[PDB]
Amino acid sequence: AVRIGPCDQVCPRIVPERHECCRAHGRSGYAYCSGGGMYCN
C-alpha cells in the first residue's frame, strides 16, 4: 500500500473518484486516508 498524488485531494470526493485515483496511477485500488494523504492498496 502506498500514497498517490491526487488521491489525497480526491480522498474526500465521492466513491468512484476515490477508486479511480489509485487505479489510474497503476495502484491496486483505494484503501484508506491516514495521516495527511490518501493510501491505495
N, CA, C, O and CB atoms as a CASP TS submission, in Angstrom:
PFRMAT TS
TARGET T0000
AUTHOR 0000-0000-0000
METHOD Language model
MODEL 1
PARENT N/A
ATOM      1  N   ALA     1       0.854  -1.227   0.000  1.00  0.00           N
ATOM      2  CA  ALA     1       0.000   0.000   0.000  1.00  0.00           C
ATOM      3  C   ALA     1       0.877   1.259   0.000  1.00  0.00           C
ATOM      4  O   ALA     1       1.786   1.379   0.821  1.00  0.00           O
ATOM      5  CB  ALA     1      -0.959   0.016   1.253  1.00  0.00           C
ATOM      6  N   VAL     2       0.613   2.179  -0.898  1.00  0.00           N
ATOM      7  CA  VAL     2       1.427   3.437  -0.961  1.00  0.00           C
ATOM      8  C   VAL     2       0.513   4.660  -1.118  1.00  0.00           C
ATOM      9  O   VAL     2      -0.710   4.524  -1.100  1.00  0.00           O
ATOM     10  CB  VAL     2       2.454   3.383  -2.162  1.00  0.00           C
ATOM     11  N   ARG     3       1.090   5.827  -1.269  1.00  0.00           N
ATOM     12  CA  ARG     3       0.264   7.064  -1.428  1.00  0.00           C
ATOM     13  C   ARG     3       0.302   7.552  -2.882  1.00  0.00           C
ATOM     14  O   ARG     3       1.329   7.434  -3.550  1.00  0.00           O
ATOM     15  CB  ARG     3       0.777   8.207  -0.470  1.00  0.00           C
ATOM     16  N   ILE     4      -0.796   8.088  -3.361  1.00  0.00           N
ATOM     17  CA  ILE     4      -0.843   8.601  -4.766  1.00  0.00           C
ATOM     18  C   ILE     4      -0.841  10.142  -4.757  1.00  0.00           C
ATOM     19  O   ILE     4      -1.055  10.754  -3.711  1.00  0.00           O
ATOM     20  CB  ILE     4      -2.134   8.061  -5.526  1.00  0.00           C
ATOM     21  N   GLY     5      -0.604  10.752  -5.895  1.00  0.00           N
ATOM     22  CA  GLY     5      -0.557  12.245  -5.977  1.00  0.00           C
ATOM     23  C   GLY     5      -1.901  12.885  -5.586  1.00  0.00           C
ATOM     24  O   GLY     5      -2.057  13.390  -4.474  1.00  0.00           O
ATOM     25  N   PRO     6      -2.848  12.856  -6.501  1.00  0.00           N
ATOM     26  CA  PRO     6      -4.177  13.491  -6.257  1.00  0.00           C
ATOM     27  C   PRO     6      -5.050  12.665  -5.303  1.00  0.00           C
ATOM     28  O   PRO     6      -6.075  13.165  -4.841  1.00  0.00           O
ATOM     29  CB  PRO     6      -4.931  13.685  -7.596  1.00  0.00           C
ATOM     30  N   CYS     7      -4.682  11.436  -5.001  1.00  0.00           N
ATOM     31  CA  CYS     7      -5.536  10.604  -4.090  1.00  0.00           C
ATOM     32  C   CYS     7      -5.851  11.375  -2.805  1.00  0.00           C
ATOM     33  O   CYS     7      -6.974  11.299  -2.307  1.00  0.00           O
ATOM     34  CB  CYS     7      -4.818   9.243  -3.730  1.00  0.00           C
ATOM     35  N   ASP     8      -4.896  12.103  -2.271  1.00  0.00           N
ATOM     36  CA  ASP     8      -5.172  12.912  -1.042  1.00  0.00           C
ATOM     37  C   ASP     8      -6.252  13.956  -1.369  1.00  0.00           C
ATOM     38  O   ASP     8      -7.116  14.238  -0.539  1.00  0.00           O
ATOM     39  CB  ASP     8      -3.843  13.632  -0.508  1.00  0.00           C
ATOM     40  N   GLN     9      -6.201  14.517  -2.558  1.00  0.00           N
ATOM     41  CA  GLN     9      -7.221  15.526  -2.976  1.00  0.00           C
ATOM     42  C   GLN     9      -8.546  14.826  -3.318  1.00  0.00           C
ATOM     43  O   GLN     9      -9.608  15.302  -2.918  1.00  0.00           O
ATOM     44  CB  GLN     9      -6.712  16.358  -4.224  1.00  0.00           C
ATOM     45  N   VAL    10      -8.499  13.721  -4.041  1.00  0.00           N
ATOM     46  CA  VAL    10      -9.769  13.000  -4.392  1.00  0.00           C
ATOM     47  C   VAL    10     -10.204  12.038  -3.260  1.00  0.00           C
ATOM     48  O   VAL    10     -11.121  11.241  -3.462  1.00  0.00           O
ATOM     49  CB  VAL    10      -9.583  12.185  -5.732  1.00  0.00           C
ATOM     50  N   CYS    11      -9.575  12.099  -2.104  1.00  0.00           N
ATOM     51  CA  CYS    11      -9.972  11.192  -0.977  1.00  0.00           C
ATOM     52  C   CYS    11     -11.366  11.572  -0.439  1.00  0.00           C
ATOM     53  O   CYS    11     -12.233  10.711  -0.294  1.00  0.00           O
ATOM     54  CB  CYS    11      -8.909  11.261   0.197  1.00  0.00           C
ATOM     55  N   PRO    12     -11.570  12.847  -0.150  1.00  0.00           N
ATOM     56  CA  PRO    12     -12.891  13.303   0.363  1.00  0.00           C
ATOM     57  C   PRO    12     -13.946  13.353  -0.763  1.00  0.00           C
ATOM     58  O   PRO    12     -15.096  13.707  -0.504  1.00  0.00           O
ATOM     59  CB  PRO    12     -12.757  14.719   1.022  1.00  0.00           C
ATOM     60  N   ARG    13     -13.576  13.011  -1.982  1.00  0.00           N
ATOM     61  CA  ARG    13     -14.556  13.043  -3.115  1.00  0.00           C
ATOM     62  C   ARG    13     -15.582  11.905  -2.980  1.00  0.00           C
ATOM     63  O   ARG    13     -15.708  11.311  -1.909  1.00  0.00           O
ATOM     64  CB  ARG    13     -13.810  12.921  -4.500  1.00  0.00           C
ATOM     65  N   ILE    14     -16.298  11.609  -4.040  1.00  0.00           N
ATOM     66  CA  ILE    14     -17.327  10.517  -3.979  1.00  0.00           C
ATOM     67  C   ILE    14     -16.656   9.132  -3.893  1.00  0.00           C
ATOM     68  O   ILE    14     -15.527   9.021  -3.416  1.00  0.00           O
ATOM     69  CB  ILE    14     -18.270  10.571  -5.248  1.00  0.00           C
ATOM     70  N   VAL    15     -17.333   8.106  -4.344  1.00  0.00           N
ATOM     71  CA  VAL    15     -16.762   6.717  -4.267  1.00  0.00           C
ATOM     72  C   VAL    15     -16.010   6.313  -5.554  1.00  0.00           C
ATOM     73  O   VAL    15     -14.874   5.845  -5.478  1.00  0.00           O
ATOM     74  CB  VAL    15     -17.905   5.685  -4.001  1.00  0.00           C
ATOM     75  N   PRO    16     -16.625   6.488  -6.714  1.00  0.00           N
ATOM     76  CA  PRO    16     -15.949   6.098  -7.985  1.00  0.00           C
ATOM     77  C   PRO    16     -14.688   6.943  -8.227  1.00  0.00           C
ATOM     78  O   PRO    16     -13.747   6.467  -8.862  1.00  0.00           O
ATOM     79  CB  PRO    16     -16.927   6.258  -9.195  1.00  0.00           C
ATOM     80  N   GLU    17     -14.659   8.162  -7.740  1.00  0.00           N
ATOM     81  CA  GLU    17     -13.444   9.018  -7.924  1.00  0.00           C
ATOM     82  C   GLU    17     -12.319   8.527  -7.001  1.00  0.00           C
ATOM     83  O   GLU    17     -11.147   8.581  -7.373  1.00  0.00           O
ATOM     84  CB  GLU    17     -13.771  10.543  -7.620  1.00  0.00           C
ATOM     85  N   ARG    18     -12.666   8.057  -5.822  1.00  0.00           N
ATOM     86  CA  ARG    18     -11.631   7.547  -4.867  1.00  0.00           C
ATOM     87  C   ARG    18     -10.921   6.325  -5.465  1.00  0.00           C
ATOM     88  O   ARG    18      -9.693   6.249  -5.436  1.00  0.00           O
ATOM     89  CB  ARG    18     -12.285   7.162  -3.475  1.00  0.00           C
ATOM     90  N   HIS    19     -11.673   5.390  -5.995  1.00  0.00           N
ATOM     91  CA  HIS    19     -11.055   4.176  -6.609  1.00  0.00           C
ATOM     92  C   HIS    19     -10.416   4.527  -7.961  1.00  0.00           C
ATOM     93  O   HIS    19      -9.478   3.856  -8.391  1.00  0.00           O
ATOM     94  CB  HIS    19     -12.131   3.038  -6.806  1.00  0.00           C
ATOM     95  N   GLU    20     -10.908   5.555  -8.620  1.00  0.00           N
ATOM     96  CA  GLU    20     -10.341   5.964  -9.936  1.00  0.00           C
ATOM     97  C   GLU    20      -8.902   6.482  -9.760  1.00  0.00           C
ATOM     98  O   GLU    20      -8.045   6.207 -10.600  1.00  0.00           O
ATOM     99  CB  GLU    20     -11.235   7.077 -10.606  1.00  0.00           C
ATOM    100  N   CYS    21      -8.635   7.213  -8.699  1.00  0.00           N
ATOM    101  CA  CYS    21      -7.253   7.752  -8.477  1.00  0.00           C
ATOM    102  C   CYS    21      -6.225   6.613  -8.404  1.00  0.00           C
ATOM    103  O   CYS    21      -5.287   6.579  -9.200  1.00  0.00           O
ATOM    104  CB  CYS    21      -7.194   8.600  -7.150  1.00  0.00           C
ATOM    105  N   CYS    22      -6.390   5.700  -7.475  1.00  0.00           N
ATOM    106  CA  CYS    22      -5.418   4.564  -7.344  1.00  0.00           C
ATOM    107  C   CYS    22      -5.344   3.757  -8.649  1.00  0.00           C
ATOM    108  O   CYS    22      -4.251   3.530  -9.168  1.00  0.00           O
ATOM    109  CB  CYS    22      -5.831   3.611  -6.155  1.00  0.00           C
ATOM    110  N   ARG    23      -6.470   3.331  -9.171  1.00  0.00           N
ATOM    111  CA  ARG    23      -6.463   2.532 -10.442  1.00  0.00           C
ATOM    112  C   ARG    23      -5.796   3.315 -11.587  1.00  0.00           C
ATOM    113  O   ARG    23      -5.094   2.723 -12.407  1.00  0.00           O
ATOM    114  CB  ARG    23      -7.933   2.144 -10.859  1.00  0.00           C
ATOM    115  N   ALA    24      -6.004   4.611 -11.648  1.00  0.00           N
ATOM    116  CA  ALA    24      -5.384   5.429 -12.743  1.00  0.00           C
ATOM    117  C   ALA    24      -3.876   5.629 -12.511  1.00  0.00           C
ATOM    118  O   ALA    24      -3.144   5.888 -13.466  1.00  0.00           O
ATOM    119  CB  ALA    24      -6.086   6.831 -12.844  1.00  0.00           C
ATOM    120  N   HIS    25      -3.410   5.516 -11.286  1.00  0.00           N
ATOM    121  CA  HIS    25      -1.948   5.711 -11.019  1.00  0.00           C
ATOM    122  C   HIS    25      -1.206   4.363 -10.953  1.00  0.00           C
ATOM    123  O   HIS    25      -0.126   4.287 -10.367  1.00  0.00           O
ATOM    124  CB  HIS    25      -1.737   6.492  -9.670  1.00  0.00           C
ATOM    125  N   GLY    26      -1.763   3.324 -11.534  1.00  0.00           N
ATOM    126  CA  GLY    26      -1.087   1.990 -11.518  1.00  0.00           C
ATOM    127  C   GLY    26      -1.112   1.398 -10.104  1.00  0.00           C
ATOM    128  O   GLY    26      -0.156   0.740  -9.695  1.00  0.00           O
ATOM    129  N   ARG    27      -2.176   1.622  -9.371  1.00  0.00           N
ATOM    130  CA  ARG    27      -2.272   1.070  -7.986  1.00  0.00           C
ATOM    131  C   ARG    27      -3.419   0.054  -7.913  1.00  0.00           C
ATOM    132  O   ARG    27      -4.306   0.063  -8.767  1.00  0.00           O
ATOM    133  CB  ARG    27      -2.504   2.228  -6.928  1.00  0.00           C
ATOM    134  N   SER    28      -3.408  -0.803  -6.920  1.00  0.00           N
ATOM    135  CA  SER    28      -4.490  -1.832  -6.794  1.00  0.00           C
ATOM    136  C   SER    28      -5.869  -1.164  -6.669  1.00  0.00           C
ATOM    137  O   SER    28      -6.780  -1.492  -7.430  1.00  0.00           O
ATOM    138  CB  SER    28      -4.235  -2.755  -5.541  1.00  0.00           C
ATOM    139  N   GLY    29      -6.028  -0.252  -5.739  1.00  0.00           N
ATOM    140  CA  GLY    29      -7.349   0.432  -5.574  1.00  0.00           C
ATOM    141  C   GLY    29      -7.310   1.363  -4.356  1.00  0.00           C
ATOM    142  O   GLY    29      -6.247   1.564  -3.767  1.00  0.00           O
ATOM    143  N   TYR    30      -8.437   1.919  -3.983  1.00  0.00           N
ATOM    144  CA  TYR    30      -8.472   2.838  -2.800  1.00  0.00           C
ATOM    145  C   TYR    30      -8.478   2.024  -1.498  1.00  0.00           C
ATOM    146  O   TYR    30      -9.314   1.137  -1.329  1.00  0.00           O
ATOM    147  CB  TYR    30      -9.746   3.778  -2.852  1.00  0.00           C
ATOM    148  N   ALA    31      -7.570   2.316  -0.598  1.00  0.00           N
ATOM    149  CA  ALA    31      -7.520   1.568   0.696  1.00  0.00           C
ATOM    150  C   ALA    31      -8.055   2.445   1.836  1.00  0.00           C
ATOM    151  O   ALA    31      -9.091   2.129   2.421  1.00  0.00           O
ATOM    152  CB  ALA    31      -6.046   1.105   1.023  1.00  0.00           C
ATOM    153  N   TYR    32      -7.369   3.522   2.151  1.00  0.00           N
ATOM    154  CA  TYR    32      -7.825   4.419   3.262  1.00  0.00           C
ATOM    155  C   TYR    32      -6.985   5.704   3.299  1.00  0.00           C
ATOM    156  O   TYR    32      -5.889   5.743   2.740  1.00  0.00           O
ATOM    157  CB  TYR    32      -7.727   3.679   4.654  1.00  0.00           C
ATOM    158  N   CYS    33      -7.484   6.731   3.943  1.00  0.00           N
ATOM    159  CA  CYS    33      -6.714   8.008   4.044  1.00  0.00           C
ATOM    160  C   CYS    33      -6.227   8.186   5.486  1.00  0.00           C
ATOM    161  O   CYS    33      -7.037   8.395   6.388  1.00  0.00           O
ATOM    162  CB  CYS    33      -7.603   9.257   3.606  1.00  0.00           C
ATOM    163  N   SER    34      -4.938   8.106   5.705  1.00  0.00           N
ATOM    164  CA  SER    34      -4.400   8.255   7.092  1.00  0.00           C
ATOM    165  C   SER    34      -3.317   9.341   7.139  1.00  0.00           C
ATOM    166  O   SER    34      -2.734   9.678   6.109  1.00  0.00           O
ATOM    167  CB  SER    34      -3.805   6.892   7.608  1.00  0.00           C
ATOM    168  N   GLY    35      -3.053   9.878   8.309  1.00  0.00           N
ATOM    169  CA  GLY    35      -2.013  10.943   8.440  1.00  0.00           C
ATOM    170  C   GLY    35      -2.444  12.182   7.649  1.00  0.00           C
ATOM    171  O   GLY    35      -3.401  12.856   8.029  1.00  0.00           O
ATOM    172  N   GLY    36      -1.756  12.477   6.573  1.00  0.00           N
ATOM    173  CA  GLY    36      -2.118  13.667   5.743  1.00  0.00           C
ATOM    174  C   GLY    36      -2.042  13.295   4.259  1.00  0.00           C
ATOM    175  O   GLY    36      -1.485  14.051   3.463  1.00  0.00           O
ATOM    176  N   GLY    37      -2.586  12.161   3.887  1.00  0.00           N
ATOM    177  CA  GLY    37      -2.540  11.738   2.456  1.00  0.00           C
ATOM    178  C   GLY    37      -3.330  10.438   2.264  1.00  0.00           C
ATOM    179  O   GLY    37      -3.384   9.608   3.171  1.00  0.00           O
ATOM    180  N   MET    38      -3.930  10.262   1.110  1.00  0.00           N
ATOM    181  CA  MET    38      -4.713   9.014   0.844  1.00  0.00           C
ATOM    182  C   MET    38      -3.763   7.862   0.501  1.00  0.00           C
ATOM    183  O   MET    38      -2.712   8.084  -0.101  1.00  0.00           O
ATOM    184  CB  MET    38      -5.742   9.232  -0.338  1.00  0.00           C
ATOM    185  N   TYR    39      -4.122   6.658   0.873  1.00  0.00           N
ATOM    186  CA  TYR    39      -3.246   5.486   0.576  1.00  0.00           C
ATOM    187  C   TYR    39      -4.006   4.447  -0.254  1.00  0.00           C
ATOM    188  O   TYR    39      -5.134   4.089   0.083  1.00  0.00           O
ATOM    189  CB  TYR    39      -2.726   4.826   1.905  1.00  0.00           C
ATOM    190  N   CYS    40      -3.403   3.973  -1.315  1.00  0.00           N
ATOM    191  CA  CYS    40      -4.069   2.944  -2.170  1.00  0.00           C
ATOM    192  C   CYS    40      -3.587   1.545  -1.770  1.00  0.00           C
ATOM    193  O   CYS    40      -2.612   1.419  -1.030  1.00  0.00           O
ATOM    194  CB  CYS    40      -3.772   3.201  -3.705  1.00  0.00           C
ATOM    195  N   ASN    41      -4.247   0.518  -2.242  1.00  0.00           N
ATOM    196  CA  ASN    41      -3.826  -0.876  -1.891  1.00  0.00           C
ATOM    197  C   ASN    41      -2.556  -1.270  -2.662  1.00  0.00           C
ATOM    198  O   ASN    41      -2.059  -2.385  -2.503  1.00  0.00           O
ATOM    199  CB  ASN    41      -4.981  -1.903  -2.209  1.00  0.00           C
TER
END
